[PDB]
Design a protein around this ligand. Sequence first.
Ligand SMILES: CS(=O)(=O)NC(=O)c1ccc(NC(=O)c2cccc(CC3CCCCC3)n2)c(Cc2ccccc2)c1
Length: 192
Amino acid sequence: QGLYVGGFVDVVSCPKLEQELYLDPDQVTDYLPVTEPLPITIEHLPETEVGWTLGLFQVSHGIFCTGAITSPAFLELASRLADTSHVARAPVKNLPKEPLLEILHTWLPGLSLSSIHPRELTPSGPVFQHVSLCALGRRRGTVAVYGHDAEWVVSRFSSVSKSERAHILQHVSSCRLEDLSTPNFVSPLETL
Ligand SMILES: CS(=O)(=O)NC(=O)c1ccc(NC(=O)c2cccc(CC3CCCCC3)n2)c(Cc2ccccc2)c1
C-alpha cells in the first residue's frame, strides 16, 4: 500500500504490434537515466496504469528499473486474488508468507520498457513512453522482484553493486509518491 517493483528491462519498440522490435540496451544508454516518472502498465495496455517508475538507470549488466505500484484498485484486487484465487496460487509455491509478492513475482516476471524505433536514434521527442509488467516477452530482462521496501527490492539483485544500489536508491528516495496522480486502472470486479 503501495508496493515497489525492481528489475532489468527489455527495450521494445512498438510492443505487441506487427512491427515489434526488441532494442539492444546500448542503443538507448545515451538517453539514460530517466528520473521523471513514466506510467507503469500491464502488457502495454494503456488503460491498466498501476503505478509510476522512480528511475531507469544504466548499470554494468543492463538497464535497471525501479517503480512504485500505487493504484489502490490494483493492490486491493491483487491481494484479494492472492488470498482467494486458486488459479492465481496454482503456479506459486504452496503457503507463501507473502502471497501478493509471490503472485506478482510469478505472473508478471517481465519488465518491458517501451521505446521509439532505433532509426530515430538526435530524437525530437521523448525516447521512452512507459514500462509494462509482462507475462510474456522477457528476453534480456530478469524476473521482476516486488517488495514493500525499495532497498529490499534492489538488494535482491546480485548483479547490482552497492554503489549502483546507492545511486538508484538515491533517486528513489528523491521521489515523493503521494504527489503523483492516481493511475487509471479500474478493477474489473467493480466494472464488469
Ligand atoms: C471480474 S472480471 O471482469 O470477470 N475479471 C476479468 O475479466 C479479468 C480478466 C483477466 C485478468 N487477468 C489476466 O488475464 C492476467 C494474465 C496474466 C497476468 C495477469 C497479471 C496478474 C494476474 C493475477 C494477479 C494480478 C494480476 N493477469 C483478470 C485479473 C486481473 C487482476 C489484476 C489486474 C488485471 C487483471 C481479470
